[PDB]
Amino acid sequence: VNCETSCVQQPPCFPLKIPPNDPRIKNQADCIPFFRSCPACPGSNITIRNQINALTSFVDASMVYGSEEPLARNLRNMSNQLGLLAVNQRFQDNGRALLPFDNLHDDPCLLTNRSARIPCFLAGDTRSSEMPELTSMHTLLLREHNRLATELKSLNPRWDGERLYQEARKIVGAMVQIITYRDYLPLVLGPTAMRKYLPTYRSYNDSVDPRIANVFTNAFRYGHTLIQPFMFRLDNRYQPMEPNPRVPLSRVFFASWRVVLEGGIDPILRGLMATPAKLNRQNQIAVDEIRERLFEQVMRIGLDLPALNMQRSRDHGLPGYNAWRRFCGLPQPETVGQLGTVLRNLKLARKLMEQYGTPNNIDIWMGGVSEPLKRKGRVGPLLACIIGTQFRKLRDGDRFWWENEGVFSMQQRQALAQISLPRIICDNTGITTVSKNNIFMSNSYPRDFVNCSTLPALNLASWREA
Amino acid sequence: KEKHYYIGIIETTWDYASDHGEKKLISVDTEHSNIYLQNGPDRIGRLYKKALYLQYTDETFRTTIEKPVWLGFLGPIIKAETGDKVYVHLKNLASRPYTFHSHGITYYKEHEGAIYPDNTTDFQRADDKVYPGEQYTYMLLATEEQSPGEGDGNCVTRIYHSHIDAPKDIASGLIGPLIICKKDSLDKEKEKHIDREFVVMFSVVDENFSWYLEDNIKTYCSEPEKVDKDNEDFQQSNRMYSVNGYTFGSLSGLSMCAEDRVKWYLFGMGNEVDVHAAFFHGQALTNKNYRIDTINLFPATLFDAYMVAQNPGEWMLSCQNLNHLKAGLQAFFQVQECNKSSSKDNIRGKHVRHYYIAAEEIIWNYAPSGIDIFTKENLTAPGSDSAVFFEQGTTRIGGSYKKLVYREYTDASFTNRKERGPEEEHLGILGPVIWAEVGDTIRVTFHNKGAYPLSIEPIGVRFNKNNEGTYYSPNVPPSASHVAPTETFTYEWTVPKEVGPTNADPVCLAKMYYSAVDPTKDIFTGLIGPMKICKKGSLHANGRQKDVDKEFYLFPTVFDENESLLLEDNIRMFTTAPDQVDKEDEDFQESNKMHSMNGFMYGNQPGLTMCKGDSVVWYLFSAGNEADVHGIYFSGNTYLWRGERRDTANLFPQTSLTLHMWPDTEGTFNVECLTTDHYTGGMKQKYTVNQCRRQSEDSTFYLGERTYYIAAVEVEWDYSPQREWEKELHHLQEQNVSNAFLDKGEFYIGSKYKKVVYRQYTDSTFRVPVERKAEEEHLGILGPQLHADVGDKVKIIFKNMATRPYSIHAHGVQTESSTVTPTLPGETLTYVWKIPERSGAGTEDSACIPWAYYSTVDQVKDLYSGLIGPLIVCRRPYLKVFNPRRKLEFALLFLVFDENESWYLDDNIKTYSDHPEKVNKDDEEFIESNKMHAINGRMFGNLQGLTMHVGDEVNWYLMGMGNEIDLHTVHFHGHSFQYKHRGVYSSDVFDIFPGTYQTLEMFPRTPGIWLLHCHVTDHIHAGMETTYTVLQNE
Amino acid sequence: CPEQDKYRTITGMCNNRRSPTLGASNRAFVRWLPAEYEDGFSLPYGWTPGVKRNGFPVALARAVSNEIVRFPTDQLTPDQERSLMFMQWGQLLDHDLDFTPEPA
């Protein structure tokens, strides 16, 4: 059974049925396509069905380097001993590096724009082409690797390809960690949840399980509530770039051709820095570009992201909202007035009771994103707990955590502490004016912007072998 | 630009070797030229009346454009830019109808100039027939489909020739080059930023295949009644080993300067024996921005070159082919001082690497154990394959041979040895591996102890005029050309970045060295050694690559001991009756011919061990003659070469390639040369993968789990169901007209053979066969198109309905074990086929690539019995989750089916023959009567199903299998293809050999049916041709 | 696992020396709470028509989306204190942490 063209509910499909009086899909014999996640133990009458993580749970920049040996090798430049990652062999972004293409049999790219003939990109993770803003981040880190390997060759001439690559990989990985924990996570959780769930790091604990919890695959999808309905492109003075400054998000999905043919990654990174995110509000959860027209160009029907999230939690056999509340030591509302009090919104509690009949049945994502945000944070108490717990385990249970002893020297740790995403953009693009720390807060040009010259670049001195 | 050249075919007397004095050539012994050039009452001579293409100024053909004198007998230089409407005004003063047919340029049927059946009116048949005293205007156009690809350069190599009977006009001389280039790469008809442009055509132009051959004999031969045309020695004297016609280095005008940015457009032409290996002596060239030295030219093969003229002097452009090299296939050229005016590098004296090799004679036993390891059968088994080579008796030498070979010593004294570790155990007949970095200076102290003068010829490094291994010229003490039996010489080579690998090539490249006094004979004595020239900052102090685990050197070749100078010794020493030794016997020559891999035969080469997780870098190279067409296959493993993923590597004399691999399957695998007469001839070996990393339950990655039903069924196979395509072709050629393959005559078989093929069945019942749909009708003799997507688990629930044991197995597909179990008459088995990343396309491969699924019970005989099929391993989101997709997929197997080598020959002799009591299997006329030259198993425009629409993307999967004579030059009429990821390369004549598997992406636009054929004389005349139908919109 | 290693393995194997697959790629997720399936071990809620969850009918995902998630885009509130880069780091980071494979 083909889940893409058939609406028949047979393995490995679990299509989402259409309700009557649907604002888009008029034919109730139709459906939104859905492939059940791969089981860990196929066809078992013994095991309880669980799903697979194809990636390393660690914050180790595996989206850049890969999580399997065949790919990791093929992502490297094997034409020399410089320790580089392979770059595109057909295109450049103003003389700067891009991703090695992958052959156009019929990958989603050659579908967004037929005549442009730009295939998807190849990176450490299979999803690098999903939106051009994501592509731009992949490209950014790939440039930083090749930049670090270059500078390390000059500082340490005896070093071969392997040593250069591993050392540049160890740096990028640490940079992903610093930005994530120092800048990103406090802005997701807020101060109170930060203190509670992510106390000050001490050292590595070999008894802390670093595996991604099944629920996190759904809970971390809170970010779908931050999505703006457009891709925003800005020129060198941060003004709307003509003639397409605001591209509807349903025309950018898998649009790899926009990176290559429509001005590279600079107008994209600038647009990401100087445009506000969408706020998650209780009556403004997620935009119709992902609710109604997700992947419209690359398949038979526009998808519904929020609905998929909910179908996915069921596929994964995830417990409901109250079960996760109880897990997190949070009170469980049982009546509509109780849910109203917990959400501090009776009108939404009612809508949820109308849908689910009891708060016990609310799907983790829906219940999670519905909760009012914590102060100076962008998730509610339930998501804060799930998200917070996951990253503490990913930190405390990583042997190669940048702050763990013997991973780096004292002077290397001191030098790394001076990195920032803005500085990486300064070091790897044609952008000379970037956001003030914190990049994730600043977004108003020119109020929250400084010149690249003010930001110290990373000191590789303590990497000299001598 | 609207370009109007005025081509004219005349009939002039051509001089093959225009003297004028006085040459000594490489291995050429003066009194040997007269074999091909001397005129008597039996030999035709050096002058030949031939058809020729000439350029003219006017529509009125009265004054010719003089042709460049290095161009020889070739037609005028035609160039065409992207979008230029190039016209061609052909006139025929000649006594017979000819044509103008061009490669890689768009034309209407009204302007193709190639005659063959094509349901077309007269107006579109006027171009196809241009008689004497006629004029035609050929409207051509260089389109976006036709122009050079992204990865190509500004200009690419193309050709044009007369096309009534392809080869017979070419052999008569009508062959001219076209230079297709990009839109604005030219100024004053001269490529932008190019100093000189030279066209080079290697062709053993066979005058026995020329129309005028008949009128050539009446004039020059003093007795036209004492001559038979079926006379081999008369046929040998007329095969003209010629580059642009001028034979024995008689080629003139080749004048180039220092720092001259020179482009070389070299293309091969002729027949099966036209196995060419071009090399510029002490010169560094680049193809597709890869560092090369030896090109490989074959019929209709289109190839270009970019060389920065360096190292001034009077050099040689010789043919590698050791038989072609001893037949004056050479050409001199000068790089002069004028003077520069730049140097570059630079570093003569820097890093000094010192080696102390010495030549010596030993008893070399090819198969030391005395057993063929593949079966545990011993070498002297009665009647067997290995028996013929490894028999010692009255006039047969046996397994042991005396052979001069390289061996390294530690110092200049040559008293004590540098010993061979576990690494050097595989080298054997190969000498020391010499290795260098860019910036070094290699110095080799050669101490010859053999009773013949020798040298060392490095291929891949720069060497001065007084350090060259070989000698050649236009005009005691120990030198470089000559190192007498007692002497010692000190070589001094330079290795800068002008000869070293560039960005695009992998770290190390495969290179070789061999004695250069008589390389047609010296090499066959075993004086060959591996080389390994590598970039700056790469190798360890010991010599290996950084982070590369193993380093292998395989030199698969046919060691012809008949050509050895130690022939007279080996006769006297091992044969029982030395008096009875017949040197000029064809059964004796095949004995001394020892098909080996590093001097080892049948699986005896050891030291080929590695673990599950090693960085294996295979360095391959070859030598020999027009029989050395190799397909070195690694079972259950896939290497990467230039971003192209294969398992079968191709070699020809003086080819040298660096394949990169990483083992994934544990087991004792095979290094078997696919060439079907080498394989049983002794070119099959063993490499082992252990377990040096804990097992650990893998298989957590299964994005696909398919199941297929194949069955080796027996049916009567008709090679030409209707011979109606055969008559119209010959009729349109006025030809007459005998068919050695298809005609029955008195006792021959004809077209119908009882063969065994794979076929697709519905299910486990094997009652309902799958119906072959119209798009998949082109398969013919081939089995169902198996599709596997990176990450799949392909189940083959095979059945063997045949009367004898067969087996199903693929190329490059991951399996569990090192053994494929055969299935028997009635039995059912399941063969697990895993599809990892390594079995899929590479970063420079088109996502859909083909693999050959075959049979392992007798890969030589089952193949020819009818067991072949295409496996299509694509990437990921191709499948559409369904079936019908707008990406037409065609698969074409190019193989000379040797019906002799079937399990059902003795059944074909009894069922279909009128007189079986008159069939002797050991007759060459009957052996030739059963080598059916068929694409997908169908001859003479018999292969239907080939149909595509205007504005379609049509995939072509071309498979190569078979024998030494199974080199196939696949050519498409009317349209070209594009290879390389993204379609970066473009060509209309491709190189398909026994082992190569390639996707070709074609973008057609012109509607009409087109000639699809291999471009090898014999093979074309052997019906290896079909058509494809491009139809216009609805 | 070697006694010494300055760098991570690609797979993530050997990070935890006592349980070397923990955190490694191509492994089952850990479960913080036991799985809730319609048949208790495999089939998802909403698979079998009429079969209720915790005594109440399973709501179609698409209907919950329509009645709770759907809002008119002109009502959109830009975050005055977060940039679009806050969204994008989140996705980039997620792709460092998990990808849940499906059959092709």
Ligand code: HEM
């Ligand atoms: C360009 C915007 C994005 C698009 C098009 C996108 C789309 C998707 C899709 C189609 C899925 C799988 C849905 C399913 O079939 O179950 C998915 C899953 C996921 N996404 Fe989003 N995503 C984006 C933004 C984000 C953001 C901003 C976050 C978090 C801050 C996020 C978190 C994830 C996670 C954690 C999963 C589960 C992944 C897995 O383990 O396989 N996404 N997304």
Ligand SMILES: *[C@@H]1O[C@H](CO)[C@@H](O[C@@H]2O[C@H](CO)[C@@H](O[C@@H]3O[C@H](CO)[C@@H](O)[C@H](O)[C@@H]3O)[C@H](O)[C@H]2NC(C)=O)[C@H](O)[C@H]1NC(C)=O
């Ligand atoms: C490093 O990490 C491990 C894991 O977080 C810490 O071990 C945990 O310690 C707590 C309290 O000692 C254990 O909880 C206990 O549960 C038992 C059994 O139900 C109960 O009898 C006690 O009331 C207590 O609550 C928890 O099980 C244990 N986890 C593991 C995986 O062993 C460890 O203490 C940390 N070490 C350092 C030095 O920070």
Ligand SMILES: *[C@@H]1O[C@H](CO)[C@@H](O)[C@H](O)[C@H]1NC(C)=O
């Ligand atoms: C490897 O590096 C060289 C030098 O920077 C570069 O020119 C080349 O494109 C790279 N090769 C690949 C495959 O990325």
Ligand SMILES: *[C@@H]1O[C@H](CO)[C@@H](O)[C@H](O)[C@H]1NC(C)=O
């Ligand atoms: C597709 O890309 C081309 C460039 O090849 C561009 O000019 C065109 O606008 C694009 N098509 C669409 C529908 O945006």
Ligand SMILES: *[C@@H]1O[C@H](CO)[C@@H](O)[C@H](O)[C@H]1NC(C)=O
């Ligand atoms: C050409 O047309 C003739 C009838 O005029 C017919 O025999 C044949 O089908 C056509 N050729 C092919 C092979 O399509």
Ligand SMILES: *[C@@H]1O[C@H](CO)[C@@H](O)[C@H](O)[C@H]1NC(C)=O
């Ligand atoms: C092969 O068989 C022959 C007898 O046919 C025997 O003399 C010989 O020992 C065998 N070969 C070896 C070396 O084992």
Ligand SMILES: [Cu+2]
């Ligand atoms: Cu031709």
Ligand SMILES: [Cu+2]
């Ligand atoms: Cu061979």
Ligand SMILES: [Cu+2]
């Ligand atoms: Cu052929």
Ligand SMILES: [Cu+2]
């Ligand atoms: Cu042609």
Ligand SMILES: [Cu+2]
């Ligand atoms: Cu032709």
Ligand SMILES: [Cu+2]
């Ligand atoms: Cu033949």
